[PDB]
Amino acid sequence: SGFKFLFFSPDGTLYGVHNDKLYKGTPPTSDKDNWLARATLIGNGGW
Amino acid sequence: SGFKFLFFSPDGTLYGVHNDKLYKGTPPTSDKDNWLARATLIGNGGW
Amino acid sequence: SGFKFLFFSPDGTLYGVHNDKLYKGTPPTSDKDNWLARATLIGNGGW
Amino acid sequence: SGFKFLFFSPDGTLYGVHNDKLYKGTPPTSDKDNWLARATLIGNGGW
Amino acid sequence: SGFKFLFFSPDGTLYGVHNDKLYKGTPPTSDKDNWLARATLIGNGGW
Ligand SMILES: CC(=O)N[C@@H]1[C@@H](O)[C@H](O)[C@@H](CO)O[C@@H]1O
Numbered sequence: 608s609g610f611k612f613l614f615f616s617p618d619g620t621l622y623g624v625h626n627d628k629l630y631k632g633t634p635p636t637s638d639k640d641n642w643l644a645r646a647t648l649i650g651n652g653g654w
Numbered sequence: 655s656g657f658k659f660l661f662f663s664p665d666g667t668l669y670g671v672h673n674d675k676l677y678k679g680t681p682p683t684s685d686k687d688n689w690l691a692r693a694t695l696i697g698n699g700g701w
Numbered sequence: 702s703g704f705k706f707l708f709f710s711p712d713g714t715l716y717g718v719h720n721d722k723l724y725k726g727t728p729p730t731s732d733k734d735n736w737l738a739r740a741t742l743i744g745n746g747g748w
Numbered sequence: 749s750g751f752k753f754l755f756f757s758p759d760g761t762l763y764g765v766h767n768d769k770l771y772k773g774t775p776p777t778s779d780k781d782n783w784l785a786r787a788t789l790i791g792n793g794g795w
Numbered sequence: 796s797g798f799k800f801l802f803f804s805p806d807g808t809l810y811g812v813h814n815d816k817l818y819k820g821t822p823p824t825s826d827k828d829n830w831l832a833r834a835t836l837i838g839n840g841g842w
Pocket residue numbers: 629649650651652653654731732733734735736737738
């Protein structure tokens with residue numbers, strides 16, 4: 608329901624591990640931005 | 655209570671997760687600076 | 702299972718500590734990429 | 749009594765949370781450098 | 796044993812906290828590199 612890791616790449620992409628899955632995307636623009644709903648799934652487990 | 659994550663973007667802005675919410679702001683320069691009060695709330699839950 | 706540390710170097714390489722071993726590699730861009738099966742093992746224990 | 753967070757800004761300034769307080773300074777130069785004694789206190793609580 | 800923190804400075808140098816002491820060094824490029832044995836001790840305790 609939260610993140611295990613949450614961190615930036617050098618180009619300013621936000622990375623996060625949520626429910627053992629790896630996600631990336633531009634950081635949220637405002638508090639109504641549903642970041643997890645639009646982040647790119649780049650890893651399907653094991654993180 | 656405290657922060658679960660506290661980290662920089664490569665652009666120099668400080669980010670923090672506090673009570674499952676996501677905040678960003680220029681880092682504080684003195685302890686007279688209540689950072690959490692002037693930080694931009696960019697995530698209302700789920701972090 | 703999963704990582705204990707997961708973080709970028711400033712040149713864009715992803716690093717991870719997994720089962721006390723250190724791994725590095727380009728970050729995944731697809732969840733078809735089994736990152737840990739192709740990451741370079743750079744530390745065999747003690748991490 | 750140790751740090752809870754310890755991390756770099758993009759210009760190379762070290763940040764640390766110690767006893768719920770936020771500190772910053774140039775990173776320690778050597779083991780004779782008492783970093784915590786010379787670091788700037790930039791946050792007096794809540795970290 | 797192991798690391799409490801393990802992170803990069805923006806100049807590419809790897810930092811690690813091991814048994815309350817702070818180390819820095821160029822990151823390992825193979826698992827034959829005993830990183831901790833060659834790392835520079837930059838803090839003798841309190842991390
Ligand atoms: C930690 C790691 O490398 N996890 C990957 C996962 O991201 C990926 O989706 C899957 C594809 O089969 O392989 C591995 O499980």
